[PDB]
Structure 1
Amino acid sequence: AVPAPNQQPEVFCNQIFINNEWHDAVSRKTFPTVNPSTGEVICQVAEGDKEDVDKAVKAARAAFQLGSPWRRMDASHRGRLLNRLADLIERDRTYLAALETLDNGKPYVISYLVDLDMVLKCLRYYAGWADKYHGKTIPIDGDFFSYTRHEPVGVCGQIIPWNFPLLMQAWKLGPALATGNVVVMKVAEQTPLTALYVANLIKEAGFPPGVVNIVPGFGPTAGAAIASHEDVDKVAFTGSTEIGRVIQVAAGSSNLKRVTLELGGKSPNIIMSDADMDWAVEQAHFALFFNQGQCCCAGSRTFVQEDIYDEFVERSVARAKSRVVGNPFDSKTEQGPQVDETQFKKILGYINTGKQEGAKLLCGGGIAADRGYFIQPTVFGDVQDGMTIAKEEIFGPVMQILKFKTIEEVVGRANNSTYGLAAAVFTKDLDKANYLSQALQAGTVWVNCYDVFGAQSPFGGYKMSGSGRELGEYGLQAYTEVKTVTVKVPQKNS
């Protein structure tokens, strides 16, 4: 039930957002953001750098001062504000979904039904938490009354990637604002537009100036400035494992700001011989190909028990061959372009590595159109653990299918990775499902499904897939600083 999109939405916001006002970079520099479907420049965007970050941080610090409107505001009112923002986003849903597709490349039907819905659910969920994250009264030894305050951690730097621009913004703003923090946010140069428009809505909703500040720009500049800033209390970063390390090192080298990381993965999707064949095949397809394969938790290692391997591979290849690649604004399109040229080439490079290393190319394997960054849905069979495409995050429409015999075997192989973001298990058997879900070293284990996200269930990596959790009650922890208050009393009684 999807409203017709404006396939060329107007852009209203393309500057740096500080104190609820729009600003050029101090340097006046700008950078183009491209439509990945055409390769054409959509528009120019203010290129924030250290000096702009510095202004944003000072605005946030000021907004976070004891006695400020934001600090004095009732927690429940923070909730009202988050709900207002959600309402405004819903009002402009059709526009935002189109803009998202324009700048990112994902099919408009998905932007509208999936990304925007999830954004709304996330904000509305966290709205509910604003006045419900209690501290404790504690029965300490001796004649004392002891309790904890759950205070905001303070000025939060938030750095988000380009694969889910609006959704990532929501996953960050929701918990941070619900718990009374202020933020300086760096959005991805590939996809700055939708986030900037939301800032307009943040203003419209009534958030005090300085509470949310957005700085578009490049990573080694604006991003590094946030990570290294002496007055940023906490940084949250979603992106590559490689940059994640830069972030944590920067935090250690600067002011020991608190850090959470949502990084990449090479998530194993395990199909047992008793799985429902049709369901497993469609889910495995979805698990890998969703969002042009641009998911950190993509099912990029499809383990299939030998007894069903041949059939599973056949059906998978057929499903991949029938997948509709094309104009993201066309309702029939299942798969849009990759986000940019760098990704485009990286993916082609990996495909080549797959060919080179002896994986069986079963379909696709090349460019899918001659404008934009479209790539054919690609499937490799007989993939081995030692192969590059079996170890490294491809982040494109490239599926790896591996064969295994025993449950003990697949556990060891699935877990033999420095990633651990997610995993899935397809089986009808109670015991197998429980054995596997316990044994897999991943932040999320899905059973007979994949990519099931709920605002109420935490998500995050084991190992080098990250640290900390987002969503659910757990998502509040990293945005809270704990204070113990311990008072002498005349005589302690139970």
Structure 2
Amino acid sequence: AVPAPNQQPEVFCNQIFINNEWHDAVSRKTFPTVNPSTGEVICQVAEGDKEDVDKAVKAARAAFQLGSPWRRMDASHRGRLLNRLADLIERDRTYLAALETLDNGKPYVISYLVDLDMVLKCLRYYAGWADKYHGKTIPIDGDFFSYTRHEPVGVCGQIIPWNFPLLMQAWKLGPALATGNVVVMKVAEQTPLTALYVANLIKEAGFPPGVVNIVPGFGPTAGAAIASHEDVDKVAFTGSTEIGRVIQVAAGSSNLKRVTLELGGKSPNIIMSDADMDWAVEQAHFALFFNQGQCCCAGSRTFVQEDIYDEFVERSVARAKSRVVGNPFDSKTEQGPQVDETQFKKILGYINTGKQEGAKLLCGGGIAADRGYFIQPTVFGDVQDGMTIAKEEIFGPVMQILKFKTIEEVVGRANNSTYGLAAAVFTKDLDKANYLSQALQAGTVWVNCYDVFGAQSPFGGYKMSGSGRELGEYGLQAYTEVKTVTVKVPQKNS
């Protein structure tokens, strides 16, 4: 029961947002944002650079000064503002989903029913946290009263990616604002429009000026500016492992700002022979192909036990072959385009690599349309651990299927990676689920499901998939600076 989209949604916001006001870049440069379903330019957007980030940080700092409206506001009132922001987003849901689909390429039905649903839920979840993150009173030795205050960390630099433009904005704003921080946010050049529209609702909701500032631009310029800024207290980055290291180096080279990273993965999806075949096939398909394959936690190594391999592979192929590729505003479409030309070409290179290193191509392998960045659902069978397509993050609709004999073997293979963002196990057996969920080196382990996210449950990487956790209570930790206050008292009693 999805409302009919406007397939040519109008763009109202394409500038830099600072102090609840719209501005051009100081250079007056703009960049085009493109519709990946057509290859056509949608509009021009302000191209922020170091000097625009400088202005945004100054605006954030000012708003975070002791005595300011943002600092004096009751914590419960921060929750109200987040709940108001959610209501505005809900009022404008049809428009935002359409705009998300236009700029990013994901099917409108999914923008509406998944992304926007999850945005609303995430904001509403964190509105609740705003007055509930207690400090502690602490029974220290000797004649003293000691306690902790959980203070906001301060000016927070947030660099968000293009695969889930609205959801990620919500994942970062939720906890930051619940805890009384202020943000300078950098949106991805491939997908800036929805985040900018949401800035207009942030103003309408009544957040004071300078609390949220949004700088669209490029990574090497506006992103690096944030990571290296001397008055930014904390940086959160979501993107590639490679860029992650730049961020963390830049933090240590500048002011030792605090860092959390959500990086890549090559997540294992392990199907035991006693799994429910029909359910597992459908979920392995979803686990890989969701969002045109553009998910950090994609199930891009599907380990299948040897006794069910052939049937599993067969069913996986048939499902991949029926997957509808097309216009994302068409209700029948399961698969839209890749986000841009760079990704397009990058995925085709990996497909080529897979053919050439002797992975067996079971379907797809090519370009699915003459217009836009559409790639055919592709499945490789008999994939080996040493192959490049088994090791590196493809970020496309390319499925790898590997075969294994034993549970002890599959654990070592699944864990033999520098990535550990997610994993999954499919089995009816209690003991096997418990053994594997314990043994897997991943920040999230799904059992008999995949890509089950909830605002309540934390998410993040082991190893080089990242550091720190987003979502849940855990997502608050990185946005909080702890202060101990220890007071001499006449005589301590229990």
Normalising by the smaller structure, the TM-score range is over 0.9
The DSSP-based 3-state class of the residue aligned with 1:190 is coil
CA displacement at 1:186 relative to structure 2: 0.2
How far 1:331 sits from its partner (Å)? 0.2
- C-alpha deviation, 1:220, in angstroms: 0.2
What's the secondary structure of 2:157's corresponding residue? Answer: strand
Deviations along 1:277-309, one digit per CA (max 9) or x if unpaired, are 000000000000000000000000000000000
* CA distance in 2 between partners of 1:475 and 1:208 (Å): 23
Write the distance in 2 (CA, Å) between the matches of 1:46 and 1:142.
59
Q: Using the TM superposition, give the Cα deviation of residue 256 of structure 1 relative to its aligned residue in structure 2, in angstroms.
A: 0.2
The question of 1:274 aligning with 2:285 is answered no
Q: What does residue 411 of structure 2 align with?
A: 411
SS at match of 1:481: strand
Q: What is the CA–CA distance in structure 1 between the aligned matches of 2:419 and 2:95, rounded to whole Å?
A: 36
Q: Give the Å deviation of 1:454.
A: 0.4
- Work out the CA distance in 2 between the residues paired with 1:76 and 1:257: 28
> CA–CA distance in 2 between the matches of 1:357 and 1:150?
54
C-alpha separation between the residues in 1 aligned to 2:224 and 2:459?
25
Give the 3-state SS of the residue equivalent to 1:48 in structure 2.
coil
SS at match of 1:148: strand
> 1:51 aligns to what?
51
CA distance in 1, matches of 2:390, 2:224: 31
How far apart are 1:341 and its partner, in Å?
0.1
1:157-183 CA-partner distances (Å, limit 9, x unpaired): 000000000000000000000000000
1:312 aligns with 2:312: yes
Q: What is the Cα deviation at residue 47 of structure 1?
A: 0.1
User: Post-superposition shift, 1:362?
Assistant: 0.2
C-alpha displacement of 1:96: 0.1
Q: Secondary structure at the match of 1:307?
A: coil
Partner of residue 339, structure 1: 339
Q: Which runs of 5+ in 1 are unaligned?
A: none
| Cα distance in 1, alignment partners of residues 33 and 107 from structure 2 | 18
How far off is 1:376 after superposition? 0.1
**Offset, 1:3:** 0.1
1:206 deviation in Å?
Answer: 0.3
For 1:452 and 1:353, locate their aligned partners in 2 and report how far apart those are by CA, in whole Å: 31
Local SS of the residue matching 1:2: coil
For 2:263 and 2:37, how far apart are their aligned partners in 1? 26
SS at match of 1:446: strand
Question: 2:55 & 2:323 partners in 1: Cα distance?
Answer: 47
CA distance in structure 1 between the aligned counterparts of 2:158 and 2:41, rounded to whole angstroms: 26
Q: In the TM superposition, what is the alpha-carbon distance from 1:107 to its structure 2 partner?
A: 0.2
How much does 1:263 deviate? 0.3
Measure, in 2, the Cα distance between the counterparts of 1:269 and 1:142: 54
Matched position secondary structure for 1:215: strand
Cα distance in 2 for partners of 1:375, 1:86 equals 35
Distance in 1, matches of 2:308 and 2:153, equals 51
For each residue in 1:380-439, what CA deviation from the matched residue of structure 2 results, as whole angstroms up to 9, or x when unmatched?
Answer: 000000000000000000000000000000000000000000000000000000000000
**Residue 102 of structure 1, CA deviation:** 0.2
2:285 and 2:241 map into 1 onto residues whose CA distance is: 25
3-state SS of 1:452 partner: coil
SS of equivalent residue, structure 2 residue 478:
helix
**Partner Cα distance (2:370, 2:478) in 1:** 45
Q: 2 CA distance for matches of 1:161 and 1:389?
A: 23
Output the CA distance in 2 between the equivalents of 1:245 and 1:124.
Answer: 33
Q: CA deviation at 1:79?
A: 0.1
Secondary structure at the counterpart of residue 126 of structure 2: helix
C-alpha distance in structure 1 between counterparts of 2:324 and 2:423, whole Å: 26
Task: For residue 367 of structure 1, report the CA deviation from its aligned partner.
Answer: 0.3
* Deviation per residue, 1:292-330 (Å, 9 max, x gap): 000000000000000000000000000000000000000
In the TM superposition, residue 358 of structure 1 has moved relative to its aligned partner by 0.2
Q: Distance in 2 between matches of 1:296 and 1:368?
A: 23
Q: Which residue of 2 aligns with 1:38?
A: 38
Q: For 2:62 and 2:3, how far apart are their aligned partners in 1? A: 42
Report the alpha carbon displacement of residue 60 of structure 1 after superposing the two structures with TM. 0.1
SS at match of 1:486: strand
* Deviation for aligned residue 1:333: 0.2
Unaligned runs of 5+ in 2: none
CA distance in 1 between counterparts of 2:469 and 2:247 reads 17
Deviation for aligned residue 1:217: 0.1
Separation of aligned partners in 2, 1:462 and 1:206: 38
1:146 counterpart = 2:146: yes
1:239 is displaced (CA, Å) by 0.2
Shift of 1:227: 0.3
CA distance in 1, matches of 2:273, 2:362: 22
Quote the residue 1:261 is aligned against: 261
CA RMSD of aligned residues (A): 0.2
Mapped partners of 2:356, 2:432: distance in 1: 36
- Count, aligned residues: 494
| Deviations, residues 197-246 of structure 1 (Å, cap 9, x unaligned) | 00000000000000000000000000000000000000000000000000
Instruction: Give distance in 1, aligned partners of 2:370 and 2:401.
Output: 28
Q: If the length of structure 1 is used for normalisation, what is the TM-score?
A: 1.00
Cα distance between partner residues in 1 of 2:173 and 2:485: 29
Give the drift of 1:134.
0.2
Q: CA deviation at 1:25?
A: 0.2
**3-state DSSP of counterpart to 1:403:** strand
Q: CA deviation at 1:148?
A: 0.3
CA shift for structure 1 position 337: 0.3
Secondary structure (helix, strand or coil) at the match of 2:308 reads helix
Distance of 1:356 and 1:88 partners within structure 2: 51
| Structure 1 ranges of 4+ moved more than 2 A | none
CA distance in 1, matches of 2:471, 2:258: 18
For residues 43 and 394 of structure 1, the distance between their equivalents in structure 2, rounded to whole angstroms, comes to 29
